[PDB]
Amino acid sequence: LEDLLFYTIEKIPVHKFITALKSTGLRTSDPRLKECMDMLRLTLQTMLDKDLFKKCVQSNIVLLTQAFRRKFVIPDFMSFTSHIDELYESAKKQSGGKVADYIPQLAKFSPDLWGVSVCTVDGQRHSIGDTKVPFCLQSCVKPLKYAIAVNDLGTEYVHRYVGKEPSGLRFNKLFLNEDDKPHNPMVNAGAIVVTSLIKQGVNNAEKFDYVMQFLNKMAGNEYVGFSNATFQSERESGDRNFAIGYYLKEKKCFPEGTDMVGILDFYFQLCSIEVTCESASVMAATLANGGFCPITGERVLSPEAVRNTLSLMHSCGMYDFSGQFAFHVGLPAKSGVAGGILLVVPNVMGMMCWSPPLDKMGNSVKGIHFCHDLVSLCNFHNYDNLRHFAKKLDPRR
Amino acid sequence: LEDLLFYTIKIPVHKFITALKSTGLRTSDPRLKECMDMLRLTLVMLDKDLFKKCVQSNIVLLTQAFRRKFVIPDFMSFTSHIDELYESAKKQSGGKVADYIPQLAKFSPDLWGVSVCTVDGQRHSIGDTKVPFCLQSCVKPLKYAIAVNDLGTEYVHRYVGKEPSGLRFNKLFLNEDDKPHNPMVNAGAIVVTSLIKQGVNNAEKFDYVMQFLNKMAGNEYVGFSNATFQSERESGDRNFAIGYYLKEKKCFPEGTDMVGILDFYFQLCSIEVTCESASVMAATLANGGFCPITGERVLSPEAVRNTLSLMHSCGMYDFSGQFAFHVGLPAKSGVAGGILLVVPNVMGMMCWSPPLDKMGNSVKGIHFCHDLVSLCNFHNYDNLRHFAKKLDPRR
Amino acid sequence: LEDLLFYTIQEKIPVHKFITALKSTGLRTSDPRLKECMDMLRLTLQTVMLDKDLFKKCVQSNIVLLTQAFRRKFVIPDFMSFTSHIDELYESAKKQSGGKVADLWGVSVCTVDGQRHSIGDTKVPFCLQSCVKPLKYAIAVNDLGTEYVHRYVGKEPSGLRFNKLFLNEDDKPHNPMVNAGAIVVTSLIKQGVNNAEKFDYVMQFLNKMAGNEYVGFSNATFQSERESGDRNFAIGYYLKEKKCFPEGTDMVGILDFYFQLCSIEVTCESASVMAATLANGGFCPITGERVLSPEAVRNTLSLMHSCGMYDFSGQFAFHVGLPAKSGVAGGILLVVPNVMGMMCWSPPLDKMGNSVKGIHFCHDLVSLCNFHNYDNLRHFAKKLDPRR
Amino acid sequence: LEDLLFYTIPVHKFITALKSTGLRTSDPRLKECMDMLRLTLQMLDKDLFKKCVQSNIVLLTQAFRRKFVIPDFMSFTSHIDELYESAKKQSGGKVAPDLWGVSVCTVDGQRHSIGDTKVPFCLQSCVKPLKYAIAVNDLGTEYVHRYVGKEPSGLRFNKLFLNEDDKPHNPMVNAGAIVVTSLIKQGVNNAEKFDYVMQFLNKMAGNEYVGFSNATFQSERESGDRNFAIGYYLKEKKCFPEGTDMVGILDFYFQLCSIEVTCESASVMAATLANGGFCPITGERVLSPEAVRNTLSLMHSCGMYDFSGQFAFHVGLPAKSGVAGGILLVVPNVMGMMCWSPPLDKMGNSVKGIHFCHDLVSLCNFHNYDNLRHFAKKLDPRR
Numbered sequence A: 001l002e003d004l005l006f007y008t009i010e011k012i013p014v015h016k017f018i019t020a021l022k023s024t025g026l027r028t029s030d031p032r033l034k035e036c037m038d039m040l041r042l043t044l045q046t047m048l049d050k051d052l053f054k055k056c057v058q059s060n061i062v063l064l065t066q067a068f069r070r071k072f073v074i075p076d077f078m079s080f081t082s083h084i085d086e087l088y089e090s091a092k093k094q095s096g097g098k099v100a101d102y103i104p105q106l107a108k109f110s111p112d113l114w115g116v117s118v119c120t121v122d123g124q125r126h127s128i129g130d131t132k133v134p135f136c137l138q139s140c141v142k143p144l145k146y147a148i149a150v151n152d153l154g155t156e157y158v159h160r161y162v163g164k165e166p167s168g169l170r171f172n173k174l175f176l177n178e179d180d181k182p183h184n185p186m187v188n189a190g191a192i193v194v195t196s197l198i199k200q201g202v203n204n205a206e207k208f209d210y211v212m213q214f215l216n217k218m219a220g221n222e223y224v225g226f227s228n229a230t231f232q233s234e235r236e237s238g239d240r241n242f243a244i245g246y247y248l249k250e251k252k253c254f255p256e257g258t259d260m261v262g263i264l265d266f267y268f269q270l271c272s273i274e275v276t277c278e279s280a281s282v283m284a285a286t287l288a289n290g291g292f293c294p295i296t297g298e299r300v301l302s303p304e305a306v307r308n309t310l311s312l313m314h315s316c317g318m319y320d321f322s323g324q325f326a327f328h329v330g331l332p333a334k335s336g337v338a339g340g341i342l343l344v345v346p347n348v349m350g351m352m353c354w355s356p357p358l359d360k361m362g363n364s365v366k367g368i369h370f371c372h373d374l375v376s377l378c379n380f381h382n383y384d385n386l387r388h389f390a391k392k393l394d395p396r397r
Numbered sequence B: 001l002e003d004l005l006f007y008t009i010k011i012p013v014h015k016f017i018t019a020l021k022s023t024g025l026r027t028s029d030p031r032l033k034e035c036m037d038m039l040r041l042t043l044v045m046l047d048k049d050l051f052k053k054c055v056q057s058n059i060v061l062l063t064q065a066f067r068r069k070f071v072i073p074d075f076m077s078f079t080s081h082i083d084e085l086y087e088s089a090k091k092q093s094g095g096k097v098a099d100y101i102p103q104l105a106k107f108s109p110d111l112w113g114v115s116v117c118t119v120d121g122q123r124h125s126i127g128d129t130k131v132p133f134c135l136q137s138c139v140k141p142l143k144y145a146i147a148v149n150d151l152g153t154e155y156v157h158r159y160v161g162k163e164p165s166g167l168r169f170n171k172l173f174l175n176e177d178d179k180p181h182n183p184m185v186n187a188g189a190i191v192v193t194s195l196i197k198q199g200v201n202n203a204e205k206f207d208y209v210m211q212f213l214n215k216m217a218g219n220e221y222v223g224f225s226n227a228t229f230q231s232e233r234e235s236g237d238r239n240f241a242i243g244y245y246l247k248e249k250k251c252f253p254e255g256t257d258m259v260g261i262l263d264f265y266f267q268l269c270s271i272e273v274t275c276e277s278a279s280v281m282a283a284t285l286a287n288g289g290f291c292p293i294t295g296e297r298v299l300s301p302e303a304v305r306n307t308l309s310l311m312h313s314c315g316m317y318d319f320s321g322q323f324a325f326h327v328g329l330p331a332k333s334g335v336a337g338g339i340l341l342v343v344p345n346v347m348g349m350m351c352w353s354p355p356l357d358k359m360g361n362s363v364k365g366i367h368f369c370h371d372l373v374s375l376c377n378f379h380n381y382d383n384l385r386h387f388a389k390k391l392d393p394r395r
Numbered sequence C: 001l002e003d004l005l006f007y008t009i010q011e012k013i014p015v016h017k018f019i020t021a022l023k024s025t026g027l028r029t030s031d032p033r034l035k036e037c038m039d040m041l042r043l044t045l046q047t048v049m050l051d052k053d054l055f056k057k058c059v060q061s062n063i064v065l066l067t068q069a070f071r072r073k074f075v076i077p078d079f080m081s082f083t084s085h086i087d088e089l090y091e092s093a094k095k096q097s098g099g100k101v102a103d104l105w106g107v108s109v110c111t112v113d114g115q116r117h118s119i120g121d122t123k124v125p126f127c128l129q130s131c132v133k134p135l136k137y138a139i140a141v142n143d144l145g146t147e148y149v150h151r152y153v154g155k156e157p158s159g160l161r162f163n164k165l166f167l168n169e170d171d172k173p174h175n176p177m178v179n180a181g182a183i184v185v186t187s188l189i190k191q192g193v194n195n196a197e198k199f200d201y202v203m204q205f206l207n208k209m210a211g212n213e214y215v216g217f218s219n220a221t222f223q224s225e226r227e228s229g230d231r232n233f234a235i236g237y238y239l240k241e242k243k244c245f246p247e248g249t250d251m252v253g254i255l256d257f258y259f260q261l262c263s264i265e266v267t268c269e270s271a272s273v274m275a276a277t278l279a280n281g282g283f284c285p286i287t288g289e290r291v292l293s294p295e296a297v298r299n300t301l302s303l304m305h306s307c308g309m310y311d312f313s314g315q316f317a318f319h320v321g322l323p324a325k326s327g328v329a330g331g332i333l334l335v336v337p338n339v340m341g342m343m344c345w346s347p348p349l350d351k352m353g354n355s356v357k358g359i360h361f362c363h364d365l366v367s368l369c370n371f372h373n374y375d376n377l378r379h380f381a382k383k384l385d386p387r388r
Numbered sequence D: 001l002e003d004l005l006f007y008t009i010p011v012h013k014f015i016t017a018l019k020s021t022g023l024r025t026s027d028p029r030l031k032e033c034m035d036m037l038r039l040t041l042q043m044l045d046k047d048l049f050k051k052c053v054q055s056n057i058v059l060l061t062q063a064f065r066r067k068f069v070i071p072d073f074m075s076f077t078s079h080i081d082e083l084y085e086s087a088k089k090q091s092g093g094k095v096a097p098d099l100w101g102v103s104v105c106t107v108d109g110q111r112h113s114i115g116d117t118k119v120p121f122c123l124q125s126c127v128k129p130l131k132y133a134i135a136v137n138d139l140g141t142e143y144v145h146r147y148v149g150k151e152p153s154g155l156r157f158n159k160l161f162l163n164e165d166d167k168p169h170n171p172m173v174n175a176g177a178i179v180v181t182s183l184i185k186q187g188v189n190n191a192e193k194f195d196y197v198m199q200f201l202n203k204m205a206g207n208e209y210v211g212f213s214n215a216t217f218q219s220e221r222e223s224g225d226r227n228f229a230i231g232y233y234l235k236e237k238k239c240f241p242e243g244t245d246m247v248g249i250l251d252f253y254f255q256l257c258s259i260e261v262t263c264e265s266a267s268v269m270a271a272t273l274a275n276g277g278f279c280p281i282t283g284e285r286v287l288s289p290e291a292v293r294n295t296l297s298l299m300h301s302c303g304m305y306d307f308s309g310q311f312a313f314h315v316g317l318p319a320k321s322g323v324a325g326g327i328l329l330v331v332p333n334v335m336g337m338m339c340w341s342p343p344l345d346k347m348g349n350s351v352k353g354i355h356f357c358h359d360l361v362s363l364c365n366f367h368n369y370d371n372l373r374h375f376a377k378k379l380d381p382r383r
């Protein structure tokens, strides 16, 4: 087992094994490779032979044997990145769009910041652009919390309070539907009702801690943060959200014993939660891997929740452009005012693209143009065929 | 290639016939034409070369079957489940049969059948699956796929939209752009209808569609009912209202006979099928434009892709939304009680029961469509690695 | 009685002093209520002077109406000064050359007592179109009743869009002043007969309404609607699916009788009496004949107020406060209850579908006079009150 | 003149004949004449009658010559009383039951009152025309209608807060009355704003009963989630005039709904709208005709909630209903009115008043598009 892997590569210099290991798409910093890397650096305290290789690499031989036997979703990851970087450059030449300026903190960002980050369901990573820069998830948070609320409360309870449909264009300026419930969890009125359902007993700060760690697990312990800067400005300008909270209260859209102003405070807080492109890309891959975090192998979300989330991101995720997005891209995604697009390609990869300038609908101009180009090249559409995709390309093989 | 196949079983002809049907195939399968013809000549036993002589022209599809390499290898277990689902829905006598015309009102409320056809041509059937019934509104995706295949997505959508109107609205004939909301509704399919074979006339236009529909079915039963055509034509005032509001707003192509298109529309709705010939029709859409049982390219994967996308969002009337959330599979409901369901990269189905619900959908059929997803991981957003407590028939 | 009036107008009267004095009252000699007086007067000219005896011989028959005329007991007593204002308003509209014809301009006046004024192109014929919508609704109510008519139609304005709907929530058309409702109210008149007797019957009503002044028909504009009726045929077919028509109705035939009714011709002058019949509780001012019922007349004016000027109705009712109906040919049917009726005809329309010169005239008229629905009669600030 | 009325006297005989006119001795226009009969006490010849009625002879003549808008008043009130007792027997409805009163004040100061017309109730929604007539009089038509529309809505278009112009639909919807409240007395504070509105409501009523209930004021402050929701959407859209504290405007808004009136003072209020801005019992100029005309217009098409269409059709009278059970009825150039009964219907209008507004016009030709010459069997109290 460790033995065949050895011959697959006299003896072996360290750099030779690390260069080939990186080619697969894995990063040496992978939590599943910690033992392999510790022993590898310990032996450099005391180039290696057969039984030595067997000593360092056996700790997680399974993952390493499958990585070198090309048993990942994308086998040739080095060509995939060449295609990703190609599309990144194509989208880059589009300087149109407007950066949101409705609060001072979103207006701070430069229009030239363009980042795209990939994380696959088998652990591989790729990045290009301004990916190490933090921004607030804003509305990208909506699926993340609905996935959480359904996890603890089941799909039936959550939908006593919220709907499962896209309202359209008109009727979508309406807070509630015929039955006095928000149309779906992906609109402001819906997210607030969703937000009220989590950790109903305890106080706000605990709920935040409860959610903040949930995102920590969905991201494989990468960067999640909080911008009190944006939180303050969001909390002192959302007059329209206060209109919603009062109509929800008037129509009894909350669980009994809910403090409406307490929920709205929590609502603003969650929108001010920070990520980078890379930290979020692992989250999207946790949605792409049935609830399991790719880079850690841990189990964070229930299959019932993950499914529903992708189902609603499909229909009502990308604002009013969802219909043309579900038609041409055929991938579940979520849009944010900071310019983030949280994309999920099921059984393949997770993804997060970012560019502050928004269009008439409120979506990342460079991100939409990129998402479209991603499907024009690869057979990733929801209703593409794995046998007959004509002039397309299948990176899974 | 053949000798090994022979070693894997002298041979009694029927013990080979048993093992072939043990794959979910029919001996009638057109891709086995040479074998069955060459077999039928030699006639109660076979040797190495006599076998070799009979299976050489079908060796690929024949090796592919016995080597457990079909989309659903264990196919006998799969049909035990399908039948268990079938019997459970068979116990739901609820609903009302469409009475607005006698043709739809004749049919017994207890008729009920479902047939499947995989992307590899594997077949199953249970119930009244050979009784002819009109597609009615299960035709809308077929001609839309026909339309996109011939004209392309760009031309077709200068005239029709790509989105679900909502709930109300959809009472409205046209959206804010003076275009029908989508081709899955009457106002939409009419404009779509007036795109197909623009040059010729109704007799030729109807001949062209039936060719295409013959292709989608591997030449299984596709017919027409004049009794339904006349009545529907007589009692379709609302469709006349649409046609006149379409002509007023200039929704049709240049030089169009909106009256002549309506008759074409009514004809296209009265096309008869069985649960079996429809099961292949849906399987073609599950196979990227390839009729599984024949192997011919019928539609472009472009038209197939858009067609599935619209059944998913717009296909089940008002229940389309709760369908995508719970079933997560592209389908189409017609007034006759038929549901054109598709499981991409896997199989296609047609479930038929005359009694409809308030939404206008088959009661036993939707019951079946839910149960199928609770049992197996066929939901569009299920995961092929961790699907918890469901069944994966793909293995 | 006649002796009093005699030197209301010396020992003798010149025959042309009498006619010139009664013309000032606003009446015409053509007035059906002055036939005997004018007839006997011509016979007397065959034997130019009038004494106490033959003046009495001539005016004895129509003395009552002739007294109210000279007692200045008519609704607009000083009429000559009012028509002086009507002209000043006329010339103002004229200066506005805006509008889109789907140049002529004239406005005619008929009070509830039969006084007349007309300035501009008041004798040129034109198509009624939607201006006939109030006329046939009143005929329906007069013959059927309000409970029958509104078992099929409603009495409600709709909204900006919902206006784009054929039916309200009850599977009824919104009001009788939109195409959908007018088609239904057209299916109510003269049911057992056919379009020949249906048309002739409705035409019979319109003639009495206008005091047998010009009512006619156009075939050119008829053949035009027949071809352009795609929208009315869409409305008609959706009307069948919801069974809004009375039973035994052939709407393909109702649609043809419909375009006929929109093709009816009037002048500003005959229309003025047709609308003055609505201002006078159902009695024609120039004939004194009862044409419609108060039930028909009241209902009609109501729907003309809230639903009469297309979408502009709300805007109209706030700055004008008058019941009215507009036509695509460019004529507006204006009504001032208890006072008068009018017709303003200028073919070019504005964006909302109303004649630009008409809406201007209506605004100026109300600006000047307290004819508004909720203007007060005791304190009207700076406005004029032609009632004195 | 005074001599003319003299032949046309014991004291009890002058004051009794006066009461037949519908006038009352409390009348602010008859004070000085009544002060004189106070002096003669502790039978009137020419000289003494001429001394008493000296001051207000012009009004008293108009009374004793049937010059008033309704000449045979006691005959008209006998019908009002009949319509009152007929409407009284209808007991259906729900209250937000045993109380029911109607009160009449003509544009000539004639008074008639029957029922529970002494009990104070809150105006509530009925204050919206009053509120709006003030602002148009104080600001103008062009300014006020830059912040609020002047059109009806529809059954579910009123589910919306704003139109496509991002203005409220009219001054008769809560969204519109919230904006109008922010148009009055912007310079001062909520305490001086309220006092100002109160003084205006006193002239309209001819110094009769106007009040305030703190009990209902607090009760509106607790429940106003829907008004809070509207108020916050109006702020997001920048609908208010600049420098507006919105959450205090709402407080003011609640205060105006909790203002107390009685059927009798409210009758004079509607009569000020029927007399063109003049108070019938005082003859003072309260509101400009522009404000009065605009108000009666919007009381016709927007006055009775959703029921305006059938109300403007069947009744043809400008009205305004409220949740306490009050309908402000206005008959132009004739009378002003107030009916009051707690139980309302599914439309929110008083079952007894609705019954009364229908029957009134069914009997009297008060409909806006009735004819003064030809009205079939309906009554004309003016002749």
Ligand SMILES: O=C(Cc1ccccc1)Nc1nnc(CCSCCc2nnc(NC(=O)Cc3ccccc3)s2)s1
Binding pocket: B171, B172, B173, B174, B175, B176, B177, B178, B245, C161, C164, C165, C166, C167, C168, C169, C170, C171, C238
């Ligand atoms: O009464 C009801 C329905 C109802 C209502 C409530 C309850 C039950 C039943 N009556 C009707 N039901 N179906 C009807 C036919 C469709 S309306 C006539 C043809 C159209 N005119 N404009 C259209 N669309 C646009 O022009 C684009 C647009 C639309 C909206 C906004 C912007 C842009 S479609 S009428």
Ligand SMILES: O=C(Cc1ccccc1)Nc1nnc(CCSCCc2nnc(NC(=O)Cc3ccccc3)s2)s1
Binding pocket: A173, A174, A175, A176, A177, A178, A179, A180, A247, D156, D159, D160, D161, D162, D163, D164, D165, D166
């Ligand atoms: O002007 C515009 C819009 C517009 C219009 C046209 C063009 C542009 C913009 N102004 C507004 N835009 N958004 C507004 C807030 C939403 S209304 C107050 C909160 C709600 N009240 N009821 C709701 N839903 C139902 O009650 C369910 C239902 C609906 C319908 C029937 C039955 C049951 S949500 S107002």
